[PDB]
Symmetry: D3
Subunit: 257 residues, 6 copies
């Protein structure tokens, strides 16, 4: 309910998670990652919640991992540290409920890596995005080497990771790093409209779409197609499917409960 | 050569398959899938045919699939239903001859899934594309969860499948969902020009290209590269290679029989 | 360092490899492939070199490959010839040091395949890229069928391979085949700028980024992620990491000496 | 349903396909492969058939592909010939009904590839198995390079393919190439006993087991697991599940109608 | 630390988890899974623990998933139920510390799937193992369709899942389903011997071995090899490596402390 | 021709590589690895050589990497060291000519990893095999964690790697770690017999089998099968295939030139 480093708001079917360390530009530290994990678990457990939005308080969405940790890591501890925080990102990606990253400002390092773990990214024009970990003599340790490459392609991902350069929102849109950009002033509203569209749909169909997409993409195409087919069987069994098929024939809007 | 729900036309080495249920916006039903399957096998079997083109009659390319069994399908029958329909799409994808989807209008749900099975998509500016299965409380069941994701990336494919929203032709082109958009008035001409270029080329080279590209993409890069090299040996044995090489060396336009 | 078909130039920590057969539009032949292999081996061996840039002399980056032998190859010999040339491309892709293809002109057939093996591509607006092998009754045999498809997607790669038509640099940028295009007049300057930015960074971190990205991309995502995490432990053992973390805490600019 | 090179017999819910070219040791020619394809399709569509068993007439199971075809083919035709035959094997492997190869004798080259395509292999002690294609200056072309390697491991597979040496049934059992070996005199009864036990189970459960095993094995373990879980949801909607669960609850034998 | 359905015992470096529902042959119910989960998380958290052993009290290791659950589930609920239970098995498989299944008797369905999630299996000759889920009109839903097939091969895994027939310990050993079998009377001794050998090794090296083997097996061979190499970097940073290499050069016995 | 740490002998078609550091049980130092690489590359390039055999001088096959190298390595140097040595193993594995490891005695750590890189392993009953790296506070770094677990299975491989314990020849054979075990006194003759058999066969066919098997095993099955088919194309172009098929048809022994 109440957290040191984040704020949570339940708004009907919408769960809003705001990173709340604005003095440190929402830098991810051990506590914030622990709290973000809990919040996301809360949301997944609570059947009122249908869509989760992550955003940042103030100027930054997230400026990265908290560097103060780093000077006292053994290599073996560094491995475990990277794996631990990255596993929080992996949980978010595998969530059975849709997730949106609303990028209001800087999304750098750990910050962009969190955004990459969400299903959909919507950014402000004023947002700046990057993986500046190479500037510290290291490299992205929260999934960025895998997720950025897959999203914008190897050449652009390598140039961003090797130089550490930030790109503007409009460039992120161009490369497909974010689904679209809008002025900061329109961001909350554009995000709310998307989330509310999704929050109307069948929770079970949404969970199956995510499972089938995520698991299928990692597999050979025939194995992903087989997963899609078997899952279609499961969705077909549901009350929301019945509601949906009957709303269509009766020319009304379905209520997917 | 004579069908209830489709029309076929052989023009030289071009084979045109037109979905023909314009009153239902060319919606896919049991009968249409069965005929499409037969038409494609004939085209693949006919040695005069070098390129296949699939398009729709009327306002739509294909606006969806019939919902008329969905009341008498058990979950297990729904699994087999999904698989049976999708496997026809897989057969088009795996044809030894180039296929082009000429998207003249709505390409929605099953219809977009069919277009995604073709090698190349050319669309009309006026075309609308999407996967609205979520609106019925189900999800795409003819390969959309796998092929859309792979073509436009996960962020945009998830947004499209979770909202059900249609996108105009020009957005499809921006996202790489179609190769080109042109005004509907120039669609048949643009398509024909492409088809005619490909039909000039060695059928055996085209067949090997499709095999190594499709099979190689699903493998580790070194395995796909090994497939490319061994196929290169095969294409080097061909009559069209001898013609092609000696045509260039003797400064002459080659004829590929 | 004295080669027949290529020129090599060491400029600080930058190594420039220029294909040098302008009369034949820098066409790849057995000799050029052999020298390029040797030059790239040299660059990788030399600890003063941080970044390798490949480019072409004259109007072409690389306009194709030598077709002279093609009418005298057996199918089994053709398989081996394909494998031999392509393995030099694979070697460039797997290099421990960042590679940039500076595409100044025609990049066709083998020439596009060479560019595809580099980490990053920067092209002139004037450049034209294509795989016209289909026009000889064959198909790309130095990795194009795999690499182009992965880069610009199946639909556009198949159209390019099936028709054999070239695309302008602006289209290549739109498809993601190159990172960006600039006017040819500004191409060297823009490439040097990128190379110099990369050459300032930790060589061990750059080597780890390439290994993790290349190997991770070929695996299921969890396996790529596991590779990224273990690699992070290796990057934390370096002096460059100590320097970079120091520098950030002391609000000063790091110097990555290696 | 009446064939030249094969005999088909339906015994209750068992479908027996017996290769019938005893003079040529059941060697696979274009006609046999054509008829085998038609026979398996026939069995799969017939809802009375639950289990398919493939065996050979006379002393051999199958002594390979027919070598009289080989010296006619160009290299491009040889690629298409390999693909054509092997795709029939693939279809057998992908069948929604359980398949058993009853290896009564010689299973060499194409014949071993045919056996590898089935779900389960039972052989006679007297059976000899191998891939002697290298003795013709070629190598296995109907899947042996892939299926044998996966079944008996690379070391033993490479030794067999590089030497062309045959192994006895007992060695095949030891290496896991067959499930069981029994004297030829007991082979039909051992096979019948296995087929009858399988024929009693839920056909839908058996179809889902095969799909999730075959597709799952080809995927990353998490994708295979996800496929197993969605399939479990489909199997829970079946009438045979209701029967089976109540039978354990009621301490009575179940009947899978 | 005190559980309704399991017993946990911490003998030095070793953590023994014993399934404790002998009247129902250690059948997995929702409570047992929750408790097993907690116990495995505990052992994982605790640096004093180096090796985890799982076994069953009584006649059976584990006779299956509690079938009384299965009556009420909609297809969607059944999907979720499979995934939830199987995700616990996944967690055991992915644990950073070595796990041994000590299979003292019946390992059926859920029971065998639990065994398959452990790193190493040692069984009594007297043990019976199988996946009898097909007898209930269903199929293995806690990972058996994927893990059994990968361990004993597709032919025999299909035969086992399609027939539901159980196999004796010695057949399990022949197929590679267990590492070895010994008489039940020597089973605890054989298991302790193995566990104590592993427990004296570098914890960081063992954690890396498991990560590299598990992640590498699921990848193309070159990617797994890449992961092996980069991990070698990490293991060469440890105090235990210095000790081990020192000990060999000095022709003496190393003591690994896992700093 | 002449090396410091290995001996080589060319007998007809066979090339024998004998590790020659018997005072250190053939432990792999930088020098031995460099010379082994050079010898296998020479053998690959020499058209007279058809089969390569690797064996050890004295008591041992090979007792692993030379441990005197290890306390000089930094972590980043250790990464590099692993990759360098293992890439020599990779090269042996991918060689275009058949390789046999004749395991005369101890094959531990790097020695077992070297044996695992060869196509076929024949061991003496007296041979002891293992991966005792864990005994040194490290783990296998020349590919053992991947190759051993693919060959004998995860449970047996994890137990050997975690305990460091050695197994005798006969258990190696049980596990499929070696093809065959014979007494040391018969080992050279058993190895020679196998080698001479393989050296009779088509060099091009043997190269294609190795490429198709190694690359195919690493792929989804359908991609492996596609590779086998196109390769069959290439092997049908060879003089040796013409000789083999016409030899069989002409009822005579083939001579594979
Ligand atoms: C984002 C940026 C471009 C614009 O910020 P700016 O206007 O320079 O203001 P700062 O971000 O320096 O100031 C905000 C505070 O948060 C801190 N902060 C920012 N990112 C941080 C991180 N990843 N970890 C810990 N602290 C961080 C700053 O050091 C500063 O703290 P201080 O003023 O109390 O010392 C700038 O912060 C930048 O250079 N980023 C470096 C931060 C970073 O960690 N980059 C690597 C991410 S892996
Ligand atoms: C199978 C085996 C070793 C038995 O040998 P055997 O006991 O001497 O019996 P035969 O060789 O007389 O075989 C019986 C008949 O079947 C034929 N036959 C066997 N395998 C055949 C094949 N793969 N293709 C065509 N015909 C075949 C023989 O030519 C012979 O016919 P004939 O009596 O009209 O001349 C032997 O037949 C053999 O070597 N077959 C070839 C197997 C092979 O190469 N398979 C690879 C498939 S590409
Ligand atoms: C293991 C087995 C062969 C032992 O047979 P047995 O020695 O006659 O023992 P019982 O059948 O009396 O079983 C002992 C008790 O444990 C219970 N039990 C055993 N396995 C169970 C399971 N998977 N779910 C629920 N309860 C189970 C039995 O119902 C019985 O309960 P009761 O004594 O309160 O009536 C038998 O319990 C069995 O067949 N279980 C497997 C169930 C199955 O088909 N699949 C597993 C699904 S994951
Ligand atoms: C194989 C072994 C059991 C045989 O024992 P043995 O018959 O007593 O023979 P020794 O131990 O005396 O070995 C003979 C010589 O080879 C040396 N040697 C053996 N394996 C070696 C290795 N991997 N690296 C360096 N030297 C090695 C020994 O140190 C000894 O040298 P010395 O006589 O000059 O001191 C034992 O030598 C051994 O355990 N070796 C280490 C194996 C290993 O851990 N390999 C993996 C390393 S990464």
């Amino acid at each position: 309910m109440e957290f040191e480093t984040i704020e949570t708001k339940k708004e009907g079917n919408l769960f809003w998670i705001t990173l709340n360390r604005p003095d440190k530009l929402n830098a991810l530290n051990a506590k914030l990652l622990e709290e973000l994990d809990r919040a996301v678990s809360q949301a997944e457990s609570d059947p009122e919640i249908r869509v989760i939005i992550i955003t940042g308080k103030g100027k930054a969405f997230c400026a990265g991992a908290d560097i103060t940790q780093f000077n006292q890591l053994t290599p073996a501890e560094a491995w475990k540290f990277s794996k631990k925080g990255r596993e929080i990102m992996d949980k978010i990606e595998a969530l059975s409920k849709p997730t949106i990253a609303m990028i209001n400002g800087y999304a750098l390092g750990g910050g962009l890596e969190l955004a990459l773990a969400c299903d959909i990214r919507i950014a402000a024009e004023e947002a700046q995005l990057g993986l500046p970990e190479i500037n510290l003599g290291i490299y992205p340790g929260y999934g960025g080497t895998q997720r950025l490459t897959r999203v914008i392609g190897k050449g652009r991902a390598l140039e961003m990771m090797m130089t550490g350069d930030r790109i503007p929102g409009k460039d992120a849109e161009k490369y497909g790093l974010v689904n679209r950009v809008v002025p900061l002033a329109n961001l909350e509203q554009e995000t709310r409209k998307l989330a509310e569209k999704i929050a109307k749909k069948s929770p079970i169909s949404l969970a199956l779409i995510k499972e089938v997409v995520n698991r299928g993409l990692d597999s050979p195409l025939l194995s992903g197609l087989a997963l899609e087919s078997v899952g279609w069987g499961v969705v077909f069994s549901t009350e929301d499917k019945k509601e949906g098929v009957s709303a269509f024939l009766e020319k009304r809007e379905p209520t997917f409960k």
